Write a protein that binds this DNA or RNA. Structure first.
Ligand code: 1F2
Ligand code: MG
Ligand code: MG
Ligand code: MG
Ligand code: MG
Ligand code: MG
Ligand code: MG
Ligand code: MG
Ligand code: MG
Ligand code: MG
Ligand code: MG
Ligand code: MG
Ligand code: MG
Lengths: 58, 113, 134, 205, 108
RNA sequence: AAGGAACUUUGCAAUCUCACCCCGUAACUUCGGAAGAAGGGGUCCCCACGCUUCGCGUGGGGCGCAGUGAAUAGGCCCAG
RNA sequence: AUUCCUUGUCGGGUAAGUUCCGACCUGCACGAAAGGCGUAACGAUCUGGGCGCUGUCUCAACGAGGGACUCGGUGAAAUU
RNA sequence: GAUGUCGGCUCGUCGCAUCCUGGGGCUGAAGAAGGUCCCAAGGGUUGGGCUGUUCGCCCAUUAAAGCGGCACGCGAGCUGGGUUCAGAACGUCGUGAGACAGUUCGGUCUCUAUCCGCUACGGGCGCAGGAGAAUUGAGGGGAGUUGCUCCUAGUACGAGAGGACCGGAGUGAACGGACCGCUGGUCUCCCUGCUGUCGUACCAACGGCACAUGCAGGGUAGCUAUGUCCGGAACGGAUAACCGCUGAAAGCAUCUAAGCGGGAAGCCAGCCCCAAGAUGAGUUCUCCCACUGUUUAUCAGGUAAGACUCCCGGAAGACCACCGGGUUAAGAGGCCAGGCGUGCACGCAUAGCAAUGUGUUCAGCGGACUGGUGCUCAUCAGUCGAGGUCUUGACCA
C-alpha cells in the first residue's frame, strides 16, 4: 500500500503545539512623508507614488 | 559549498534570452517594471551594454548587435543614449521597489536608466 | 599509479614484452636482498616501487617466458612524479624492469629513460644499464 | 602558550635552499593587550588581546568603556591566551622564531549540509547493478528488535565544516616584522581573510 | 572574517618577488633547458632537457612551462617552475607557428 | 588524472564502433553462404585539366586539434 | 538441459578456474521417430573465453538541468 | 485478521575463549627463531581466481590476514544470484492426472515517516534589573594501528653458521583532519575554432537551432584527490599478570598476615573538539541608571544603555541562524587600472586567379581575482528595551 503511515491520531493538543510558530508577523508600516497614507520601508508609497520625488503615476 | 558568483533560474539559452530580452526593453523604453530578482540580474548586463556602446566605432556597435537584435534599439543606444552618458563613470541604472503582486505574491520593482 | 591488473611495457631484454600487475609491495632493498613489506595494504605502485607480476606477452627465445610470476621495479609512469625543487616528470607509457630477489636486473640492458627516483631508491644496477636518467 | 592573532592572506610557492615550500602567509598584526586575567581577580591566569581596528562610531558604549580602561583603541576581535603574561602590547617579533614549530588554529570553511559520503567517507552504493540507493545514502541505520534504537553518535548527514580546527606542529619558514607577516609551511584551516590563532606547540616533540 | 583594510594582492606580491624569475621571451617552439642535477649525491651534474614548449601555466612565483621531448623512443614531459633553483637557463633553439596556447595535440 | 572489469550472480549498465566510397577478408559449408567477416585507407576548401550527370576522376595548392567537422549512425572475435 | 557420491580423474586455458572445453567410463538413473548421433546457415536463446573501450570498479569529483528547500495561490492520502 | 526467508552490499557496535601488536611465567629458553600458559579488548585485522554460496580450496602479500553475538544484526536501506508461485526441458517415479533427493533456462521486491530513536538547525522561556563582550570546565565526545632500515653492534651469546635484548635515529603503509600553493580533474557560455540550416535587405560581420552546452579545443575563481601540509605521542598517577623489600603466624623459610616498591598498546590524566538548560543555570570586564501613572482603569506607558525591523551583500547558509556594510558610507554593483584566460578582433591595406596568407595587432574579447573611485542602491522611518522580591549575617558613615 501507502508505506510509512501515521500510527495514532495526533491529539488536538499535539496538533496545536506544532502550530505555535505559524503566526504571521504584521508588516512594519511607516507613514509617507508626503501623501500621508501608510507605506513599506524601502518601497515607493502606494498612494502618491513618491520616493523623495514622485516616481510612479498616482 | 557554492561560493561561485552569477545566478540562472532556467537553462543556459534561456538565461541569455531573458538577459537580452529585458536589456532591449529597458534600452527602448527607458523604464520597465519587472520582478526584483529579475531586475537585479539585469542591472549589470545593461550597464555593461552602455560601456560597449560608449566606444562609438563600428566594432563597438557590432559588439552591441550581438546582444541587441533590434536594428532601432542598437541605433538608439549607439547614437542617442551612450553619447548622453559621456561623463557618467558608469551607473545609469537605478532600481526602485514597487511592492507585492496578487497572483504569485512577488515583490515588483522598477528599473530605469 | 600502477595497481593489480595494470599492464606494463618491459624496459629490458629479459625476454618479457608485457607484464601485468599482481601485487604492489612496500619495495625493500637493504643489507641482505630486497626487504620484507612495510604493510599488506598499499594501493599504488609509483616509480621505484617493486611489484609482483604475471607475464602476458613474452618473446620467443628468452630467460623469462609467459605466465611466469615475477618481480619488477617501476621505471616509468604516465602518472606525474614530483621532485623537491618543484619540477615534474611524466612519461607517455608506464614501464618496469624485471628483477631477481636481490633487486638486480634479469636482462643485460635497459631500454628508454628511467626515473632519477630509482637512484634515490638504491637501484644502482638498473640506473647503470639505463640510457638516460631524467 | 605564547600566542598571537592574525589573518590568513594566501598561499604561495617559495624556495629555501634547493627545495620548494608551500607557504600560508599570515599577517599576525599588532595585538593590543587589553585585559590581564589573574588568579587574584578572575581565578585563572590569562591575557585578553585584540585584533583588527574598529572605527570609534561603530563601537558601542559598553565596549568603549572596556577599551578606555586599558586605554587602547577599539578592536573587533578579542581573545584570551592562558598562561601567557607579556609586557607592553603583543607583536610576532621575538614572540616567534624562524624555525619554531607552531599550532595554527581557525574556523574551517563551511560546506553546509553534507551527506554521509562527503561528511564521513561512506561508500554509498552501486551505480549500476540495480539501484534506487545509487551512490550516496547510508546503509543500515541499525540492527533489529534489540536496541530498537539507533546508537547515539551515529555518523549521519549534517552541517559539515565551519568548526574550530587546530593544526599541530607547523614550521615557521620566514618572518617579516614591520610588515607584520609570518610565513608558515603548509595549510592553516579557514578561508583567506579569516581569523587565525598562531601559538606555541600544544605539546612539542 | 577579520575585516582588516588590506591589499592581500600586493601583500602576496611582496613575498614573491624574492622568488620570481624572468626568463626569455618564449611562447611555444623548441628550447634547451639546462637543469642542474645536484641530486647525484655530493656531486653536482648538469643535464639538458631540450624540446617543444607545450604549455605556460601560472604567474609570479607559481609561473611554469611544460616541455615535451621524445627520449630513447619514449615520450617525456617536464614541468618547470621559472624560479626553480635547479634551472640554470632556458634558451630559444627555434621559434614556432601555433594557433593556440596549449598544443596538447602533439601528444599523438 | 592514473588504472581498465580489478565491479559483479553476470561487463547488468554505460562507452567504444557508427554513413558512403576504395583496398582487403578465415575456419567451415547444404557450395547459396558464412561476410559488413576480420582488418586497413579515404572523406573539407580553392584552382587547373578530363568526362557519363544531380555529380565524378587526376594533378597542384590552402586551412583547422579535428573535414559522414553538427544530427541520424554495426563494437568485433573464438568455442560450446 | 541426464552424475547421487562430486569441486570424479587427467589435460587445456588463468598468477590462481566448484563453472567451461576436451579426453577417460565407475551410465545412482543415456540410447534410436516419448527418435539416436551429427550438421552449414539462422537466434532480443543459454554457457564459457578473448580483443577493444569504458566511472562497473579502485574512488570518486566537478558541472548542468528537474524535484527536494523558501514565499504567495489552491490543497489530497493510506492510517488512527 | 502475516514477526519477509539464504547469500551479497551498506552501515556499524559489542563478548573474549586474543589472529597481530603490548606486559609476563615456564621451556626439551645459549643467541636468533620458537613452544606453552597467564594478564590484556586501545587500535588493527589485504587484494584477487572458482562457487548464489556462507564455508572451503588456490594465487599474491601481510604485524596479523581471530572466533563469536546483535530476529543465523541490518530488504518502510539496496540487490535478488540461491530457495518456495504460474511457462518449459532432462533424468527418475507414477497406467494416468501429476510428482522429487533432483538438475536446467525464464520469471512485478509496494513515490509522501505520525510517535520514539538518530544527525543537523532554530523559535520560546528560565538563569531575581536592562544591556555589549571575554570566559572557567562539572561533564561529554574524537583520537588510539603498525612495518621496514640504520645506530648501538658484527657487541652480548655461540665451537662455529649465525646473531640480539635494552636504548636512540630515520623513512613508509593504511587511516584521519585541514587546505588548494603545486600536480591534475571540473569549471552549461569566460575565449577561440567547425558543420548544416534559418534570420538580421544583400556582401561582409553576427545571432538562433542542432542537449536539458550543436560539436570540438583550452580555461580563471570556486569546489576537488588521485595533490600537499599535519597527526596517533612524550611525561605523569594508579593498576593487571608478574617481579621484589621489610616480615611474623610456624625460634627456619616465606613478595603478605599488617605495611612498602616496581610493572602493560588497557585505567584516570595529558592531545584535539563540544560544553553553565552544570534549573546545582558559575566567573570577569564595561555600560545605562532610579522615570511617569486620582483611594474610578491594582501595573501598564514615555525612555536610557542596547537591540530588532527593513535594505545592499557574504569564502555564512535549505529556511532560520551567523558575519559585514548601510551616506559620519568604499558593502555590493558599475566604472577605472591591474591580474589571469583565450591567442591576434572588426575595419582597411597588401600578396594571390582563388582558397587563403601577411601587416596594422603580445591584437580583440572577457564570469567569479586584486586594488581604487562616491556613478547606482543601501532613502525614509518604525518597533522594542531597565527604574531592580524577601530573610539572615558581616562591614560602614
Ligand atoms: C507494487 C504495489 C503492489 O505491491 C506489490 O506488488 C508488492 C511487490 C507485493 O510484493 C510481493 O508480492 N512480493 C512477492 C515476494 C517478493 C515481493 C515482496 C514481498 C515482501 C516485501 N517486498 C516484496 C506486495 C508487498 C504483496 O505483499 C506481500 O505478500 C506476500 C505474500 C507476503 C508479504 N509479507 C510477509 C510482508 C507481503 O508484503 C502484496 C500481496 O501485493 C502483491 C500486498 C497486497 C496488500 C496487495 O495486493 C497490494 C494492494 C499490492 N497490489 C497493488 O496494486 O499494489 C500493491 C501494494
Ligand atoms: Mg561509489
Ligand atoms: Mg528492517
Ligand atoms: Mg592547468
Ligand atoms: Mg559439447
Ligand atoms: Mg505553498
Ligand atoms: Mg522460511
Ligand atoms: Mg609475548
Ligand atoms: Mg586549477
Ligand atoms: Mg568544453
Ligand atoms: Mg608505579
Ligand atoms: Mg548592522
Ligand atoms: Mg571590486
Amino acid at each position: 500500500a501507502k508505506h510509512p503511515v501515521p500510527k495514532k491520531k495526533t491529539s488536538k493538543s499535539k496538533r496545536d503545539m506544532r502550530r505555535s510558530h505559524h503566526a504571521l508577523t504584521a508588516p512594519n508600516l511607516t507613514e509617507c512623508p508626503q501623501c500621508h497614507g501608510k507605506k513599506l520601508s524601502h518601497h515607493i508609497c502606494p498612494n502618491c507614488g513618491y520616493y523623495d520625488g514622485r516616481q510612479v503615476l498616482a | 559549498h557554492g561560493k561561485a558568483g552569477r545566478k540562472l533560474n532556467r537553462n543556459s539559452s534561456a538565461r541569455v534570452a531573458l538577459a537580452r530580452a529585458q536589456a532591449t526593453a529597458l534600452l527602448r523604453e527607458g523604464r520597465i517594471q519587472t520582478t526584483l530578482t529579475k531586475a537585479k540580474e539585469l542591472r549589470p548586463f545593461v550597464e555593461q551594454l552602455i560601456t560597449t556602446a560608449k566606444g562609438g566605432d563600428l566594432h563597438s556597435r557590432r559588439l552591441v548587435a550581438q546582444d541587441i537584435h533590434d536594428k532601432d534599439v542598437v541605433r538608439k543606444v549607439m547614437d542617442e543614449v551612450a553619447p548622453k552618458y559621456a561623463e557618467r563613470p558608469g551607473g545609469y541604472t537605478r532600481i526602485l521597489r514597487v511592492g507585492t503582486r496578487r497572483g504569485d505574491g512577488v515583490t515588483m520593482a522598477l528599473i530605469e536608466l | 599509479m600502477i595497481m593489480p591488473q595494470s599492464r606494463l611495457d618491459v624496459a629490458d631484454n629479459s625476454g618479457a614484452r608485457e607484464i601485468m600487475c599482481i601485487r604492489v609491495l612496500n619495495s625493500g632493498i637493504g643489507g641482505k636482498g630486497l626487504t620484507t613489506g612495510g604493510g599488506g595494504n598499499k594501493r599504488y605502485a609509483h616509480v621505484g616501487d617493486i611489484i609482483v607480476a604475471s607475464v602476458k606477452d613474452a618473446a620467443p627465445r628468452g630467460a623469462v617466458k609467459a605466465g611466469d610470476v615475477v618481480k619488477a621495479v617501476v621505471v616509468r609512469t604516465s602518472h606525474a612524479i614530483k621532485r623537491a625543487d618543484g619540477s615534474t616528470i611524466r612519461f607517455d607509457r608506464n614501464a618496469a624492469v624485471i628483477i631477481n630477489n636481490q633487486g638486480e636486473p634479469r636482462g643485460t640492458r635497459v631500454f628508454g629513460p628511467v626515473a632519477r627516483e630509482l637512484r634515490d631508491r638504491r637501484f644502482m644496477k638498473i640506473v647503470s644499464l639505463a640510457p638516460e636518467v631524467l | 602558550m605564547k600566542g598571537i592573532l592574525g589573518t590568513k592572506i594566501g598561499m604561495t610557492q617559495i624556495w629555501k635552499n634547493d627545495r620548494a615550500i608551500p607557504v600560508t602567509v599570515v599577517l599576525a598584526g599588532p595585538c593590543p593587550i587589553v585585559q590581564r586575567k589573574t588568579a587574584q581577580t578572575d581565578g585563572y591566569e590569562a591575557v585578553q588581546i585584540g585584533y583588527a581596528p574598529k572605527a570609534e562610531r561603530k563601537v558601542n558604549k559598553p565596549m568603549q568603556g572596556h577599551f578606555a580602561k586599558a586605554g587602547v583603541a577599539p578592536t573587533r576581535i578579542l581573545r584570551e591566551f592562558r598562561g601567557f603574561a607579556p609586557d607592553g602590547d603583543s607583536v610576532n617579533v621575538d614572540i616567534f622564531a624562524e624555525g619554531e614549530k607552531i599550532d595554527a588554529t581557525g574556523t574551517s570553511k563551511g560546506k553546509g549540509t553534507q551527506g554521509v559520503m562527503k561528511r564521513w567517507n561512506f561508500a554509498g552504493g552501486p551505480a549500476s547493478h540495480g539501484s534506487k540507493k545509487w551512490h550516496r545514502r547510508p546503509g543500515s541505520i541499525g540492527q533489529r528488535k534489540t536496541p530498537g534504537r539507533v546508537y547515539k553518535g551515529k555518523r549521519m548527514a549534517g552541517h559539515m565544516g565551519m568548526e574550530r580546527v587546530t593544526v599541530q606542529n607547523l614550521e615557521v619558514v620566514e618572518i617579516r616584522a614591520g610588515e607584520n607577516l609570518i610565513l608558515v609551511k603548509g595549510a592553516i584551516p579557514g578561508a583567506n581573510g579569516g581569523l587565525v590563532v598562531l601559538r606555541s606547540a600544544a605539546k612539542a616533540s | 572574517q577579520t575585516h582588516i583594510k588590506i591589499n592581500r594582492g600586493e601583500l602576496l606580491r611582496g613575498i614573491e618577488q624574492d622568488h620570481t624569475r624572468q626568463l626569455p621571451d618564449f611562447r611555444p617552439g623548441d628550447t634547451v633547458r639546462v637543469d642542474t642535477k645536484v641530486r647525484e649525491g655530493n656531486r653536482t651534474r648538469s643535464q639538458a632537457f631540450e624540446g617543444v614548449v607545450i604549455a605556460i601555466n601560472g604567474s609570479g612565483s607559481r609561473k611554469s612551462f611544460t616541455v615535451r621531448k621524445i627520449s630513447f623512443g619514449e615520450g617525456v614531459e617536464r614541468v618547470f617552475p621559472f624560479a626553480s633553483p635547479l634551472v640554470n637557463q632556458v634558451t630559444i633553439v627555434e621559434r614556432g607557428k601555433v594557433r593556440r596556447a596549449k598544443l596538447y595535440y602533439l601528444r599523438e
